[PDB]
Amino acid sequence: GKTFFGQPLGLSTLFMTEMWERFSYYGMRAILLYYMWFLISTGDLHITRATAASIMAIYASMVYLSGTIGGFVADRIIGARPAVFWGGVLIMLGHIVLALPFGASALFGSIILIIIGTGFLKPNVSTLVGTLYDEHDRRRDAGFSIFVFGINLGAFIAPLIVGAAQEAAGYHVAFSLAAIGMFIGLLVYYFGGKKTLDPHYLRPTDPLAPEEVKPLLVKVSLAVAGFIAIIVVMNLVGWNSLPAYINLLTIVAIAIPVFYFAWMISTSTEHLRVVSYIPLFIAAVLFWAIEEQGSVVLATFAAERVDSSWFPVSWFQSLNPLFIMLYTPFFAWLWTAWKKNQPSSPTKFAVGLMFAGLSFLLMAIPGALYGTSGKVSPLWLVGSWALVILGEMLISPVGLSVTTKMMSMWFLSSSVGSALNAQLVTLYNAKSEVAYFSYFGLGSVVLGIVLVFLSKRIQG
Ligand SMILES: CCCCCCC/C=C\CCCCCC(=O)OC[C@H](CO)O[C@@H](O)[C@H](O)COC(=O)CCCCC/C=C\CCCCCCC
Ligand SMILES: CCCCCCC/C=C/CCCCCC(=O)OC[C@@H](O)CO
Ligand SMILES: CCCCCCC/C=C\CCCCCC(=O)OC[C@@H](O)CO
Ligand SMILES: CCCCCCC/C=C\CCCCCC(=O)OC[C@@H](O)CO
Ligand SMILES: CCCCCCC/C=C\CCCCCC(=O)OC[C@@H](O)CO
Ligand SMILES: CCCCCCC/C=C\CCCCCC(=O)OC[C@@H](O)CO
Ligand SMILES: CCCCCCC/C=C\CCCCCC(=O)OC[C@@H](O)CO
Ligand SMILES: CCCCCCC/C=C\CCCCCC(=O)OC[C@@H](O)CO
Ligand SMILES: CCCCCCC/C=C\CCCCCC(=O)OC[C@@H](O)CO
Ligand SMILES: CCCCCCC/C=C\CCCCCC(=O)OC[C@@H](O)CO
Ligand SMILES: CCCCCCC/C=C\CCCCCC(=O)OC[C@@H](O)CO
Ligand SMILES: CCCCCCC/C=C\CCCCCC(=O)OC[C@@H](O)CO
Ligand SMILES: CCCCCCC/C=C\CCCCCC(=O)OC[C@@H](O)CO
Ligand SMILES: CCCCCCC/C=C\CCCCCC(=O)OC[C@@H](O)CO
Ligand SMILES: CCCCCCC/C=C\CCCCCC(=O)OC[C@@H](O)CO
Ligand SMILES: CCCCCCC/C=C\CCCCCC(=O)OC[C@@H](O)CO
Ligand SMILES: CCCCCCC/C=C\CCCCCC(=O)OC[C@@H](O)CO
Ligand SMILES: CCCCCCC/C=C\CCCCCC(=O)OC[C@@H](O)CO
Ligand SMILES: CCCCCCC/C=C\CCCCCC(=O)OC[C@@H](O)CO
């Protein structure tokens, strides 16, 4: 019968929904840093470029952190299908805000809308993909990989289209194209979903029992009052600059996994089978930090150290999803052409971190060889993204499987690694380039070597 690459036809609806949301997301992040540079250059935004780079990292950290709770809100309160829709509406409003004739005053409102909207949408679109298959259907893994291909496709064409529009018609038009991309996703999702999506998911599947409402409200109210209390204390003692608020979000983002690990210890049955995952969680954090610096540090390098006079420099951001799409069929082959081998997940995470470290070590070569005052070939960045995505092909598909032996924890390692970036990327500039690349690249390599050592002990 009529299928979508052998899958239920409803997959095409969710395929396009996420392809256009990712288009709106990565099209925005391909030019947002340069947009802040521009506002700084005109005197409208009064921050350093180091702070702007820090804003990009904590922005990503909050988006992934917001995705850790969006599944709960849909499953218990509003439903998975309304969560995707209203999440898409909030994302669209987030980009419209940047298309309005405002300046730096609109940056915070746009960031908040997209953080909340992406938290509602991203975890619950993947959830809706699963609802196309029951628990016995073997097509589940094939349908998700096709779904992932739509993710990378939108992430691939967005910097090309949006980056070109910025260079031709300016930032406001470019951001409006991101808003239009999400709008297209809303049209296809709304009318397409009504035809093929199970109406059971218009409502929460585990709605709150009557006695559960109050303790949740107490739990939410205590968290907001405490967070607001901290901001009050900060302004009393003088810690009220934008870097101080970024440091607050950094501490909050890192304190979540460490508190969820400190009292997770207190049953020797898996007392140490949970300590097992910690050398792997720290490995995932450091890999995601390197990977998410491509839109910050490597975006800075592309704009300042690469002779890219004949094409928009935001196009470099397409190399990340391009290498993902090129690598995946080879690794799908490898993970079943090598049935006999299938090396251990702790070794996969160890080697994956070493490739990420090799991507930065490679970036230290041109500055050490030619100096940092000139311009170098774009192929240096191509080789860097080739190496780091090779590290992703190891840790990303096996990643959720290690901790199970929830994607929120893998939303979480991305948030912590991106929160770590909010501190580190302020260290990057033309004078620190070689030392920044060489030492964070070397440190990432040796931490992949100690993990290979520890890998024998971890498997138990
Ligand atoms: C069948 C698939 C095999 C793919 C594996 C090979 C990787 C692909 C291409 C490697 C090309 C090597 C670099 C070429 C080179 O040396 O540049 C020559 C060029 C002359 O016009 O000159 C230079 O001007 C350049 O400025 C000099 O600087 C360098 O070349 C330093 C290069 C950085 C080191 C890279 C060396 C080896 C990378 C191999 C990676 C393989 C990993 C596969 C998992
Ligand atoms: C999607 C971004 C990847 C771009 C990769 C481009 C690969 C280019 C390799 C050759 C190095 C740049 C050559 C510069 C060049 O030829 O310019 C033409 C001439 O007008 C001098 O500017
Ligand atoms: C006005 C500014 C508000 C911005 C909203 C951003 C909200 C971001 C995050 C809030 C959720 C934090 C709690 C996340 C959490 O603890 O879940 C982790 C857990 O699921 C691990 O599996
Ligand atoms: C109108 C206010 C903004 C939109 C409301 C949604 C704001 C995001 C989160 C509010 C807290 C909801 C409860 C989240 C929660 O308890 O997460 C628990 C965590 O274990 C999830 O698995
Ligand atoms: C700025 C935009 C304001 C909001 C415009 C859209 C509101 C118009 C009608 C409400 C539609 C709500 C549909 C919620 C929903 O669950 O949709 C799921 C989708 O699969 C269709 O069932
Ligand atoms: C429980 C709450 C967890 C904390 C979530 C709060 C995250 C809220 C906002 C993060 C935005 C990052 C900073 C935005 C920013 O700096 O832009 C404004 C700046 O350009 C104005 O000069
Ligand atoms: C379909 C409903 C949501 C999608 C967004 C709809 C509005 C998008 C674009 C309308 C025009 C965008 C504004 C362009 C603009 O004003 O910037 C250009 C000009 O101000 C600078 O010279
Ligand atoms: C200044 C530019 C306009 C700013 C407001 C843009 C809002 C325009 C349209 C709202 C689109 C709602 C989502 C699109 C959609 O498919 O909704 C269908 C649903 O509402 C039908 O019941
Ligand atoms: C930051 C501001 C957030 C404002 C909205 C956050 C609300 C968080 C917790 C309160 C949830 C109460 C929802 C009650 C509900 O819908 O269920 C009622 C019913 O199912 C019980 O029988
Ligand atoms: C539950 C216990 C509450 C105790 C306080 C918890 C939060 C403690 C410290 C938060 C500090 C925010 C980040 C530090 C900071 O503001 O740095 C300031 C510095 O960069 C110059 O302003
Ligand atoms: C999440 C619970 C409600 C919290 C209400 C208070 C939220 C206030 C700040 C959240 C963090 C964003 C801080 C970014 C910021 O405001 O920078 C302003 C900048 O001008 C510093 O002077
Ligand atoms: C008993 C609980 C386990 C032991 C406590 C572990 C510490 C818990 C939370 C601290 C989060 C790490 C500090 C965040 C960080 O490294 O950045 C600091 C920087 O932003 C301040 O300028
Ligand atoms: C071939 C694939 C992996 C690529 C990484 C291989 C290169 C490994 C390390 C290169 C970094 C060399 C750093 C040299 C250096 O820092 O010198 C310092 C001085 O020359 C610059 O200030
Ligand atoms: C198989 C990987 C190919 C070789 C990778 C090893 C690359 C090691 C260093 C990068 C080239 C070194 C550039 C020369 C250098 O750093 O010296 C500069 C300094 O001595 C001048 O004062
Ligand atoms: C799996 C792929 C590993 C990548 C290997 C690392 C290769 C990285 C950089 C090679 C730099 C060669 C650039 C020389 C070049 O062709 O352009 C000449 C330049 O002067 C034009 O601007
Ligand atoms: C098990 C949880 C994983 C925790 C991974 C994060 C590691 C903990 C703290 C990292 C602190 C990074 C501090 C960066 C730093 O101080 O240098 C940058 C600073 O100059 C920014 O102004
Ligand atoms: C020599 C240390 C053990 C080697 C472990 C293998 C690590 C992979 C490639 C070698 C990386 C060499 C990095 C050289 C380096 O960091 O120099 C720092 C430079 O800034 C000082 O000249
Ligand atoms: C064990 C968990 C590792 C997570 C954190 C790893 C890095 C932690 C702190 C780094 C801050 C110290 C910065 C060292 C440094 O000088 O780098 C800057 C240099 O390369 C350029 O000047
Ligand atoms: C300056 C030298 C650069 C090249 C050295 C890098 C390779 C050297 C040693 C790597 C293997 C060290 C031993 C690791 C090992 O086999 O531990 C056993 C482990 O597999 C059991 O889980």
Author numbering: 5 to 270, 275 to 413, 423 to 477
Task: Quote the paper.
Two examples of protein crystals embedded in LCP were studied: lysozyme as a model soluble protein and a peptide transporter (PepTSt) as a more challenging membrane protein. Based on the obtained crystal coordinates, both still and rotation wedge serial data were collected automatically at the SLS PXI beamline, yielding in both cases a high indexing rate. We have produced an end-to-end demonstration of a simple yet robust and efficient offline crystal-prelocation method based on 2D full-field phase-contrast X-ray imaging on flat double-sandwich samples, a well established format for serial crystallography.
Crystal-specific properties such as the size and diffraction quality of individual crystals also influence the indexing process and therefore the measured overall efficiency. This could explain why the PepTSt samples yielded generally lower indexing rates than lysozyme. We attribute this difference to the crystal-quality variation between chip 1 and chip 2, as only chip 1 was used for rotation data collection. Such sample-to-sample variation is common for membrane-protein microcrystals. The prelocation method was successfully applied to both the conventional MX data collection with rotation method and still-image data collection by serial crystallography.
